[PDB]
Design a protein around this nucleic acid. Structure first.
Lengths: 89, 78, 100, 92, 97, 78, 89, 102
DNA sequence: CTGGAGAATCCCGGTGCCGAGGCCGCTCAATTGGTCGTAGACAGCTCTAGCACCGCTTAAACGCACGTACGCGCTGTCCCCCGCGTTTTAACCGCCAAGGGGATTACTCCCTAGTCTCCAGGCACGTGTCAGATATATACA
DNA sequence: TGTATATATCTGACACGTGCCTGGAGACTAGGGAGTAATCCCCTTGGCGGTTAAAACGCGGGGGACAGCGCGTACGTGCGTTTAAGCGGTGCTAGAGCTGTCTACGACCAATTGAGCGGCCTCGGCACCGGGATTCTCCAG
């Protein structure tokens, strides 16, 4: 179940808006969906250069494979800078 | 013959939902045909799942796996 | 959290737990679920922005998968993302052809 | 007039999200064709309605590709040959 | 005035190059097109030429998918003529547009 | 100008295997458009795989991986 | 590669027939392609029953999912035949 | 090899060893990939048998990928299994419709 | 129109090239003699879930008049892809150096799984109240 | 006939709130996954340099998709009617989860070994080719 983080970020973004349980299961199945998209593509991607360790460069490359253009630049932006802030700790 | 339980007015309302004005009688039994082909597909591979699973109650996650295999992603049931 | 190491909200250890038991490699670098949960938190952020703004702007208070339907079908990037994907309890967008 | 109220019905069923077909003969049709492999499986009724969900979603998608065929064939009267082109491009 | 009919000769040569197994376009402008478009994205690209041959192969095979698929589309529209609505239609039915 | 290097009567011969009697002139350029889209997708993701491999020399295994992932798998090249 | 194995079975079926190396790479590549097809289907279906182990029932299930018809059942006859012959020895 | 032990040709140790070395599951059952490669010699016998027959259909001894192309595309189960996947230098199934004929 | 001059294409017979086919060491990749904690099916039965009988009702569905609104056939279009032939340009064949890049020598580095704990983040598991469901009452096209 | 607008109470759903527990990290380790320094050779780059087949270009030709008209239908709307789906209420009924259970099964080490790997002749299958037999056919009746 993914009600925790979707609902809390939902409380961080839209305070005055409700939600059904149906769409919450849509969020759960959605994150499962694209999650397995990325895990599958990266899982193929590591062998392609004879690597067996799932690190972030494979993931960001896979993001460069998947998302078209603008939101890829935004995902590389906020995610890569999010990794940079993770390295600041 | 519960294929007639798929009623002709329901096919009319789905055809209007597709925006169809003049609906031939040819369209209804063709809908039964191609639709029922999809049905035989789904009951076929779904019963391959469940009979592979050796279980007697067909659950929702089975046809989640089935429509999942068909390139047909559905949300709201997982 | 390791999200509190990162300044984020998605669970690094739980998504990383799905990496560890998702059975893809024997040894896995821990740097991958940070960027993974980061990108999913960003994509989650704009898709929930479209959710709350889409359902909220239509004189509605609770997000229903109908508004997920015209929320995704009003989007082109989500069209790129959810092309082979069907939304339950969504119906269709109000899309009538000019010939209709 | 034959159709303006029907166009409002188009806006209703394109506005509504629930199903439209009688659910028990639908269920007995699922079990009926399902007896080809084992008779009287146990089902969730909502699972049967979810086969109706994705199934009629494919149907409405076929009404949209058939619809674009009718736009392409300059007509409002859908034909089985329109379904021949639509299924043909879908490979059926 | 050694002439033929206006129209049957195209049909026979259609019968040949449908009946036969070969490509139709050049090699070097394709290869310099691989270099040409490819310089736009990262400098100093060195190219296996057989990869370029394979990409021309899969290119024209995808073109067979194109003109045969939209061929059947124009056939449905009571036409021997390809129109842009054949292309944009059929690729929309593919889900590409 | 090698998008024009794929010549117009070559596209006509692609209608000869394509089986077209009457060829509109706009079909050539839109065909170059879809061609450009298809190609730039392929070399785009292919050079993404190339930049992950820390390379400067593009191999065929790139478009093996991409055309696998593009659902138009090709054989005879490893 | 697997060129020699296709070569041996080729000479089992058609001794009086040559083969080109390009077609050899076509069908060797095809064999490897279907090899990851069953490997992926066996992976997801292995995840479905949540087993650590894939047996001939899961593989047989995967083929009977993917392969359309009676010729697949004859492949069940050949595979069950040779494996079942190979079992007790 | 265990292939000739099982009455096969296709390599058991290479393929089953790939079944450990492919990142799919924890434990790799013994009877599964021999059953699998048995289906491979089945389908190999299918397409290779059609390839020899079609290569004889143009009275040739050595198989070109053309006969693979119209080998798959003329079979219902092969073309249904291979409607999306393209082979190299195979060519096109000849198909004349009514739009060419008078 | 049927019925032929001339191309289309198959065929009948060279040749000679190296592509597949076969030939020769030699492993290195597959195979196994042996251990080693164990992963998965059935034993037993639930309780919840799911099918089934009892019994009343209604927009849905089926049956029917009618008057339509649309599918398409006949003729007309001109322009436009194709037919004939032409003319060039860069494609194509064959050629030279080169340094880049992939491979190859280990090198050499820190990292990424294994273990116990921990202990609060998080997950089972209930109420309420208010947006909305559904009226409750009100004015207009 | 469809629409919009304050009024009213009822529902249950999702937010809230309580009780239990679990899930991922902290430190530490170990040897090895994977970059790295060197670095070499051969091969792909980027040209030369002769060849010629490609494709473009012009000049019309008669007929393609559409269009105008028009015939001639097949069905959507309305309407009567009843009705099986709906509903709902309960009764009957078994199916996957839970606990165990009990041992097999793929790792694990190393030893073996011989099949294919790398590589090298090589025979004739075939790849144009000169030239002929035959069918198809564009333009004549």
């Amino acid at each position: 179940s993914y009600a925790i983080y979707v609902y809390k970020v939902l409380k961080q973004v839209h305070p005055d808006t409700g939600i059904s349980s149906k769409a919450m299961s849509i969020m759960n199945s959605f994150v499962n969906d694209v999650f397995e998209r990325i895990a599958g593509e990266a899982s193929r991607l590591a062998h392609y250069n004879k690597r067996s360790t799932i690190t972030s460069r494979e993931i960001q490359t896979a993001v460069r494979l998947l998302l078209p253009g603008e939101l890829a630049k935004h995902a590389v932006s906020e995610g890569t800078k999010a990794v940079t802030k993770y390295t600041s700790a | 013959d519960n294929i007639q339980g798929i009623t002709k007015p329901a096919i009319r309302r789905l055809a209007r939902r597709g925006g169809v004005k003049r609906i031939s009688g040819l369209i209804y039994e063709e809908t039964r045909g191609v639709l029922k082909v999809f049905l035989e597909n789904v009951i076929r591979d779904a019963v391959t799942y469940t009979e592979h699973a050796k279980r007697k109650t067909v659950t929702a996650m089975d046809v989640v796996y089935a429509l999942k295999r068909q390139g047909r992603t559905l949300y709201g049931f997982g | 959290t390791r999200s509190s190491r990162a300044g984020l909200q998605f669970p690094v250890g739980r998504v990383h737990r799905l990496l560890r038991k998702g059975n893809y490699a024997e040894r896995v670098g821990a740097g991958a679920p940070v960027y993974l949960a980061a990108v999913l938190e960003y994509l989650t952020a704009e898709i929930l922005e479209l959710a709350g703004n889409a359902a909220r702007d239509n004189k509605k208070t609770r997000i229903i998968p109908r508004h997920l339907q015209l929320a995704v079908r009003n989007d082109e990037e989500l069209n790129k993302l959810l092309g082979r994907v069907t939304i339950a309890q969504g119906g269709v967008l109000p899309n009538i052809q000019s010939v209709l | 007039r034959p159709g303006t109220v029907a166009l409002r019905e188009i806006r209703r069923y394109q506005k509504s999200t629930e199903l439209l077909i009688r659910k028990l003969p639908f269920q007995r049709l699922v079990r009926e064709i399902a007896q080809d492999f084992k008779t009287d499986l146990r089902f969730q009724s909502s699972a049967v309605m979810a086969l109706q969900e994705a199934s009629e979603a494919y149907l409405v998608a076929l009404f949209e590709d058939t619809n674009l065929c009718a736009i392409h064939a300059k007509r409002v009267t859908i034909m089985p040959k329109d379904i021949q082109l639509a299924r043909r491009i879908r490979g059926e």
